[PDB]
């Protein structure tokens, strides 16, 4: 008997079993509906400071593997699941989920009514929580920790995850046959994209490389000036945790790129940035969008795409400046999903065109980007 317990701000207690590290974890608790991809999810920086609950009962069926890591580490504060399978059963597996959580030092609990939890969050919105795994978990403690929590709401998360020094990426996408390929040689990629690391998913880079870009990764706080100096074919705004304050540095820099004619493309956080920097307003969502079955309509072609979502904040459509045109909306809630600058060669998408995990439907967003890029170089 290895106990574990999870307590919500509201005081709602979930008693189950520990399947990860011994100790505690406090964080905003969220629910993800993805039936496959738990590893990629756990390794997504966007999850920093968050307590992740998966709706799919059996988590860990296929073990873990390095190729399935979206970042250099686990970003999730904790993991909440219903059942941890007896074994991992998949040719690609290199280490069972429990061992992996241990290795990464993640506090994780299993055997709790995730459905109850899910419904609570949907109904009453996101809540801070605390998990405690050990010999005799103390609920009041847990409760206490939960309550004490500052929360995300008014936190600069991206700074926490961003890279300390800038670097170069030239590695493309995994293939069943070849796996993760050898990094390409600079001279092999036509373009040169500068990517702002606000806590970037590796699949985003890989799939950019795939399209012929040679990247240069940069810290969140990097100055437009310093950037411009590099002579970028494209400027990319990565995904990441939390939301930017209209206050912060990237806004300012983003604004400056928008004075120029360079092509700008952001994903998720990147999208919010672009929107703020354009005079738009972001909002925190009741519970947000986290899952991989999200219908998104391209209002421009009236077509639907099934996508990978992970966001708690969103761009208020009603407060959109006239230079921002709506390109996509959620079919689930009608929230704003895509935008394009009428005046500039800038656009963004709330969802994760890079999936990983998730359906490949939105991959083409990348393409527009290359187009842009190519036409910029034409001039």
């Amino acid at each position: 008997i290895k106990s574990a317990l999870l307590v919500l701000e509201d005081g709602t207690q979930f008693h189950g079993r520990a399947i990860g590290a011994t100790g505690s974890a406090v964080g905003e608790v969220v629910f993800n509906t993805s039936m496959t991809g738990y590893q990629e999810i756990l390794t997504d920086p966007s999850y920093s400071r968050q307590i992740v609950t998966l709706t799919y009962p059996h988590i860990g069926n296929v073990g873990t593997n390095d190729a399935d890591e979206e970042s250099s580490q686990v970003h999730a504060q904790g993991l909440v699941i219903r059942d941890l399978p007896l074994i991992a059963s998949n040719f690609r597996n290199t280490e069972d989920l429990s061992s992996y959580l241990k290795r990464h030092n993640i506090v994780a609990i299993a055997d709790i009514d995730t459905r109850k939890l899910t419904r609570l969050l949907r109904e009453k919105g996101a809540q801070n929580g605390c998990i405690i795994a050990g010999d005799n978990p103390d609920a009041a403690l847990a409760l206490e920790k939960a309550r004490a929590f500052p929360g995300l709401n008014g936190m600069d998360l991206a700074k926490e995850v961003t890279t300390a020094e800038a670097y170069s990426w030239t590695q493309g996408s995994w293939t069943l046959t070849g796996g993760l390929p050898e990094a390409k040689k600079e001279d092999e990629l036509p373009f040169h994209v500068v990517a702002y690391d606000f806590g970037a998913k590796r699949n985003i880079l890989r799939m950019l490389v795939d399209r012929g870009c040679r990247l240069t990764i940069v810290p969140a706080q990097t100055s437009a000036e310093d950037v411009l100096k590099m002579n970028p074919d494209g400027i990319f705004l990565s995904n990441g945790p939390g939301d930017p304050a209209p206050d912060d540095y990237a806004i300012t820099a983003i604004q400056k790129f928008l004075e120029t004619d360079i092509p700008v493309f952001g994903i998720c956080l990147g999208h919010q940035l672009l929107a703020l920097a354009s005079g738009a307003k972001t909002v925190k969502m009741k519970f947000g969008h986290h899952g991989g079955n999200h219908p998104v309509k391209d209002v421009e072609k009236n077509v639907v795409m099934i996508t990978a979502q992970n966001h708690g904040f969103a761009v208020d459509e009603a407060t959109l400046p006239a230079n921002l045109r709506v390109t996509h909306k959620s079919l689930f809630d009608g929230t704003l999903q895509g935008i394009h600058r009428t005046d500039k060669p800038a656009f963004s998408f709330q969802g994760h065109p890079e999936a990983s995990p998730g359906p490949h439907d939105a991959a083409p967003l990348f393409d527009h980007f290359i187009e842009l890029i190519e036409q910029y170089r034409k001039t």
Partner: protein, 1058 residues
């Protein structure tokens, strides 16, 4: 875009009678389709020869045709209804086959009928195996190494190339019909010859083996805007080499990494795009090498199917309703998701927070000479589904809901049997219907998960789970009931262990475990299905039980509730007919204002469609499970009389537990079911019954047998013994004893009793004599040969019986007519399988009326007090699964073996019968050469039959004795040799196409075993044969009619009723 405007009227091709591989799922689907199109204001016309379908309910559509599903008949329908469009993807293979034939015959052209949902070319692209293989290669998807063959020589050559074992798959077939696994050349020629002949396009695809790879399916839907979604993914528990339909499968997939899932998802889509499915759904099948993720495409089915129905139940996403809507120009984005209160759209992929398990249901015990190993051709007769929060939970619930008497992993071999491991071994290596239990036994006997794997190829992810349960069972067994503390029990309930299985292990009564649970306050909670893993709320009450914290049942305090218990999986004798009744009870009562709650777990049925009732508990129909529902629902009444044996069997115990059973009492029920109790009442009523005896000993029997008089009906598997010598014989191989009523007419009578009056629903006279099960007999309503005076006698005995037995709602009574004398065969105090047929025939919805009765509204109050005798004849005929089990002697007898039935409507009996015969898929011809080989007692009446055939223009052949009799009457048939007599013999002649008709009657076990070859050959070579003289006559009469001459709708039929 919105709905199509250039279309007003639509013809929907139904699936026809239920058969192995093509079952109720099509009633579910056809109904959804009818519902969906009528909702969208279209004029619906449909064709379905199967009368036990909710889809043929008059009020469901505009113009309903219960006529043989033959292109020439549909032609008359088209000609008469002038449908603008034709939807051929909701009727199984029958529908695809018919659409294309219609196409081929120029009929669609002739009346300007536009094919919707799927095009003729799309269908062929998918259905023609060569064409499918070519499309895959075009899209870069990999297929097994294979070869097309149109002949045996061609076939042999491909085999030469792919080696054994090899898989054979016919073009234009499904459910594995006509295919198999060839381990050798001998096996090879047999299946090949069988499939070439079965293939509509006389073509096979022969593949190299992938036996043992993982098997997967994906349910896809596509709209005209090119929007595409995966409705559900399915992972087969049983590997490649055992047909999906005969396999245990779960949703969603379990062992694929996201990467692998996306690749499979992409291919899926690619497959629909390439074949050309633009407005509807399809099932795409794959094989995956567990060793390397290597993906292979197997097939695609351009229509709704058994998996689509399972997928729809599994997720709450109504695939067919949606697809029907897509076929008429709507797009996914334009439609709303049903269960999420319409709040969200149909354009999204479902996400589920539970595990779904499907287990097929078999009936091998009814086919003893049959090969009972599982292969690529389906052999299951039904399936059950279960939902649990975990796979263990899900798995065990399905087991206890399977209706085969298991309570979960009940043991098959003894721990102390020295030969146990060898048996287990064999059962593992060569899967049969019992494999699942044998896996558990394996673990009890000491084999390791890897050993099991090696023999089974079942993924270890599943295996480990079964192993853990066995381990738990062992502890239960060690600690006994005393160690069944609350923590432990709870654990056990969470893994899905049944009170019954626990009881067994602890050596106590089930009620003891149950009581234990009550003490501890250990009850399940109910979760709801919502398609989105709780991401959105739902206003629908589609629930399953589980042992968790939060309950979502939220029962009403508001209304008076009525509970309808389903029949669980379908099996021979427990078909869709009972389901139909169930559905009607719920529809009528609901309409009447009650709150209807359905309890069933058959994924194929209308009963488990959330739209049929107010509340749906998708649960095993067992005492444990029902009690839990009653516990929280506190219904006003419960109906146990409409779901067949399953619920009937729980009646007393439910009552014992305090359940408010309505309608005929559990005790009443037993009075009729118990022989003894029944024999006393007959007596009391002064009715006639066949002499009988209850023998203990052999020698006892022989004596008593003398008493009763031969022939004799030995009901312990039933047999007809003819002489003393016969008696022992049986005994060896081998207790009620009844005098067999030889040369008697069998009759069925359906009726309703309200305590005040009796309503005769219908008097059905069987074509086949008593001794051929009623469930396998053709029948007529009205009687075609029985006197009005004799019928009047039966009506009276029925009334006397009804009142005496205290019937309340439906009842069924079986009689035998011998020498102008009425004898009682049996009383079934509940809804019988003929009910739906009687309803259709007479236009009175007996199941609705009787449910009203059961609920409190008398016959007089409803206005249904007089027996209807329609102005036309109605004939029901059956369909037999012999073709799926070639080693079985395709002969009729006292045990029921058919899977489905059809109905034929005519101005005369001859016409009705001809329609029914045709609709049954008979290969009868109006010309040719007939073979006559009859038993002694038939020798007399065969002359007349021989003359009638002669009058029709047939030529005749006959075996020795038959020829002798014919000769004396002035008829000289050509003589034929019996196999043992020389050449040529029958077998040669039949195999050479010399006959278009066979009448072969046989009496007596040995003579039966002896004549085996005729019937077997007849079937193998598609020649129509009759095994009863009565049937022979009926066939003769039909020769005078033309089934394609006139068609009539159900609405029309009903309208002629006064």
């Amino acid at each position: 875009m919105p709905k199509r405007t250039d279309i007003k009227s639509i013809l929907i091709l139904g699936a026809g009678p239920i058969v192995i591989g093509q079952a109720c799922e099509f009633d579910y689907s056809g109904a959804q389709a009818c519902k969906a199109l009528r909702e969208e204001g279209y004029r619906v016309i449909l064709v379905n020869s199967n009368p036990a379908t909710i889809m043929t309910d008059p009020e469901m559509a505009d113009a309903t045709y219960i006529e043989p599903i033959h292109w020439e008949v549909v032609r008359k329908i088209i000609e008469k209804e002038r449908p603008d469009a034709v939807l051929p993807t909701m009727g199984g293979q029958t529908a695809l086959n018919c659409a294309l034939e219609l196409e081929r015959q120029g009929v669609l052209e002739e009346f300007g009928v536009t094919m919707i949902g799927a095009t003729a070319d799309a269908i062929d692209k998918a259905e023609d195996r060569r064409r499918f293989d070519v499309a895959m290669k075009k899209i870069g998807l990999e297929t097994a190494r294979s070869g097309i063959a149109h002949t045996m020589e061609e076939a042999l050559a491909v085999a030469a190339d792919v080696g054994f074992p090899c898989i054979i798959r016919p073009s234009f077939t499904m459910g594995g019909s006509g295919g198999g696994i060839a381990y050798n050349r001998e096996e090879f020629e047999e299946i090949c010859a069988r499939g070439l002949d079965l293939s509509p396009t006389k073509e096979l695809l022969i593949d190299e083996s992938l036996i043992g790879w993982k098997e997967y399916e994906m349910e896809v839907v596509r709209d005209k805007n090119d929007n595409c979604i995966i409705v559900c993914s399915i992972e087969n528990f049983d590997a490649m080499g055992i047909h999906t339909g005969d396999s245990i499968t779960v949703a969603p997939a379990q062992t694929l990494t996201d990467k692998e899932y996306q690749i499979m998802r992409n291919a899926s889509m690619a497959v629909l795009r390439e074949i050309g499915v633009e407005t509807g759904g399809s099932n795409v099948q794959f094989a995956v090498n567990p060793k390397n993720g290597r993906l292979i495409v197997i097939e695609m089915n351009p229509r709704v199917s058994r998996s689509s129905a399972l997928a729809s139940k599994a997720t709450g996403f109504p695939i067919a309703k949606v697809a029907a809507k897509l076929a008429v120009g709507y797009t996914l984005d334009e439609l709303m998701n049903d269960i999420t209160g319409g709040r969200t759209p149909a354009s999204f992929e479902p996400s589920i927070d539970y595990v779904v398990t499907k287990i097929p249901r078999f009936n091998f015990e009814k086919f003893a000479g049959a090969n009972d190993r599982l292969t690529t051709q389906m052999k299951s007769v039904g399936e059950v589904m279960a939902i649990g929060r975990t796979q263990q939970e899900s798995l065990q619930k399905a087991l206890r809901g399977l209706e085969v008497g298991a309570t979960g992993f009940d043991p098959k071999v003894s721990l102390d049997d020295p030969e146990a491991l060898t048996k287990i071994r064999r059962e593992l290596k060569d899967a049969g219907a019992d494999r699942i239990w044998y896996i558990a036994d394996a673990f009890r006997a000491g084999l390791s998960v890897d050993g099991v794997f090696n023999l089974t190829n079942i993924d270890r992810w599943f295996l480990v789970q079964i192993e853990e349960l066995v381990r738990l069972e062992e502890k239960v067994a060690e600690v006994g009931i005393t160690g069944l503390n609350a923590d432990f029990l709870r654990q056990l309930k969470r893994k899905g262990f049944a009170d019954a299985r626990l009881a067994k292990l602890a050596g106590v009564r089930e009620a003891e475990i149950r009581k234990l649970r009550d003490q501890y306050d250990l009850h399940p909670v109910y979760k709801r299905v919502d398609t989105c893993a709780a991401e959105f709320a739902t206003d629908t009450a589609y629930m399953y039980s589980t042992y968790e914290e939060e309950c979502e049942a939220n029962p009403s305090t508001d209304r008076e509730k009525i509970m309808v218990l389903g029949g669980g999986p379908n099996r021979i004798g427990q078909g869709i007919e009972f389901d139909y009744c169930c559905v009607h009870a719920s529809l009528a009562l609901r309409e009447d204002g009650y709150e209807t709650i359905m309890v069933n777990c058959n994924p194929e049925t209308v009963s488990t469609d959330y739209d049929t009732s107010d509340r749906l508990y998708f649960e095993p129909v067992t005492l444990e499970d029902v009690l839990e529902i009653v516990r929280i629902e506190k219904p006003k009444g419960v109906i146990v009389q409409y779901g067949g044996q399953t619920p009937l069997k729980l009646a007393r115990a439910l009552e014992a537990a305090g359940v408010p059973v309505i309608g005929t009492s559990p005790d009443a029920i037993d009075r009729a079911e118990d022989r003894e109790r029944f024999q006393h009442a007959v007596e009391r009523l002064k009715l006639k019954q066949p002499a009988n005896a209850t023998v203990t000993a052999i020698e006892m029997a022989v004596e008593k047998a003398k008493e009763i008089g031969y022939p004799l009906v030995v009901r312990p598997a039933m047999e007809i013994v003819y002489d003393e010598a016969d008696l022992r014989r049986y005994f060896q191989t081998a207790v009620l004893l009844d005098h067999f009523l030889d040369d008697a007419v069998e009759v069925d009578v359906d009726a309703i009793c309200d305590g005040e009056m009796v309503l005769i629903g219908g008097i059905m006279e069987h074509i086949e004599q008593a001794g051929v099960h009623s469930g396998d007999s053709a029948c007529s309503l009205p009687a075609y040969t029985l006197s009005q005076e004799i019928q009047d006698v039966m009506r009276q005995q029925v009334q006397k019986l009804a009142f005496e037995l205290q019937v309340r709602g439906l009842m069924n009574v079986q009689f035998a007519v011998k020498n102008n004398e009425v004898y009682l065969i049996e009383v079934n105090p509940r809804a019988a399988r003929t009910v739906p047929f009687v309803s259709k025939a007479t236009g009175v919805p007996l199941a609705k009326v009787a449910a009203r009765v059961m609920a409190g509204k008398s016959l007089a109050e409803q206005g249904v007090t007089k027996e209807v005798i329609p102005p036309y004849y109605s004939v029901k005929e059956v369909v037999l699964p012999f073709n799926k089990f070639p080693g079985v002697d395709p002969l009729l007898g006292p045990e029921m073996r058919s899977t489905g039935e059809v109905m034929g409507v005519g101005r005369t009996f001859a016409e009705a019968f001809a329609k029914a015969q045709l609709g049954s898929n008979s290969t009868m011809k109006k010309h040719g050469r007939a073979l006559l080989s009859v038993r002694e007692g038939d020798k007399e009446r065969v002359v007349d039959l021989a003359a009638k055939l002669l009058k029709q223009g047939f030529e005749l052949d006959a075996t020795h004795g038959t020829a002798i009799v014919l000769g004396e009457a002035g008829i000289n048939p050509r003589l034929v040799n019996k196999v043992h007599e020389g050449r040529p013999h029958i077998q040669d002649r039949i195999k050479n196409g010399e006959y278009t008709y066979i009448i072969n009657t046989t009496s007596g076990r040995r003579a039966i075993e002896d004549s085996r070859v005729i019937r077997r050959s007849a079937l193998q070579y598609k020649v129509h044969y009759d095994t009863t003289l009565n049937g022979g006559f009926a066939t003769a009469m039909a020769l005078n009619a033309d089934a394609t001459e006139k068609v009539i709708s159900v609405q029309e039929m009903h309208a002629q009723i006064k």
